[PDB]
Symmetry: C3
Subunit: 139 residues, 3 copies
């Protein structure tokens, strides 16, 4: 509980970020008059809508790495990457709300923080399994 509360706060902030992205896509449906179950519309509606679809798909990938890196490497370091990723996702959504070019940079900034979580999850898991394997192989 104590060693996972930063991971739980970054998690809740990520959920609130997804709520923001749903509020924005629901505004574009009223503005461009796009009626459900239609996902097609003007170039800008499809961009705002597509920005949300992508963020939603990446949300469990972010959660999985945040929790694994947080528990196997260091909670504060994984929660720091968790914020960097979530801020890059806000910028990605805001960029896609202007154009597809404008979303490119915050997409690579989010990919950056996501690879950082994967590296910390891998380093933490290797520091757990490897010493015991080195002992078994040498025995």
């Amino acid at each position: 509980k104590d060693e996972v509360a930063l991971l739980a706060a970054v998690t809740l902030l990520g959920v609130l970020l997804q709520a923001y992205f749903s509020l924005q896509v629901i505004s574009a449906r009223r503005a461009f008059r796009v009626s459900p179950p239609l996902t097609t519309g003007p170039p800008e509606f499809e961009r705002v809508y597509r920005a949300q679809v992508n963020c939603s798909e990446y949300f469990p990938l972010f959660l999985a790495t945040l929790w694994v890196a947080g528990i196997f490497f260091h909670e504060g370091a994984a929660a720091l990457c968790g914020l960097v990723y979530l801020f890059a996702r806000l910028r990605y959504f805001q960029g896609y709300a202007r154009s597809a070019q404008l979303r490119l940079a915050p997409l690579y900034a989010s990919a950056r923080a996501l690879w950082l979580l994967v590296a910390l999850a891998a380093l933490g898991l290797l520091a757990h399994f490897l010493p015991a394997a080195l002992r078994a192989a040498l025995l």
Copy 2:
């Protein structure tokens, strides 16, 4: 294990609910003759299909809040909201299977239970971090 088994049961029930929604979308593909990878078809096929897409997107948001509220506020109270949300999602799918108007009410009933989980996650995290911050600031 003991303090998370209700959260794990509500989780498994949510997975079984997603299995039900996949069984229903696969029935609409045989009924309206919609062949994969096509996601377009009659107004009712797109509605059943779209109801499932939305539920799938919300599933990790539900899981994140259920587990955070369950561990930082109260397991039984978060599992109670977890059932309210899952029942509203069954009604949302059944409503969308009739029309887009008919899905509106169970969608706001699911949003209701989802905001309740977010409030309990926030209250639980504030009860953890705030006393220590009040002590540090006053020291």
Copy 3:
């Protein structure tokens, strides 16, 4: 930490599998010249793209069952099913990259391993709640 490290490794491997599926869909966008936010294109682009959408949707369902079965039944047995599911998903993506028929078999092989995780989660939860219920009812 010790009793969840296999579940955390199978989790990280599932994240790396999703990274592979994104690398493949981004290759199809350059090859068939499909520009975002467009999700429509030649029959093969829509198949590679659709294979990824499905995998992404199933990822939290896999994570939920892997962790519940791993903690309530047996970590090694749930991690074994976790690998069977992830290998069937690689084959599903590779099959869909050829045709919709070719994806059918690895889709049922993934459904197989997913039902196995659900059964172990159910058996583990029943072994937890049922003895106490039998005692209460008989008392």
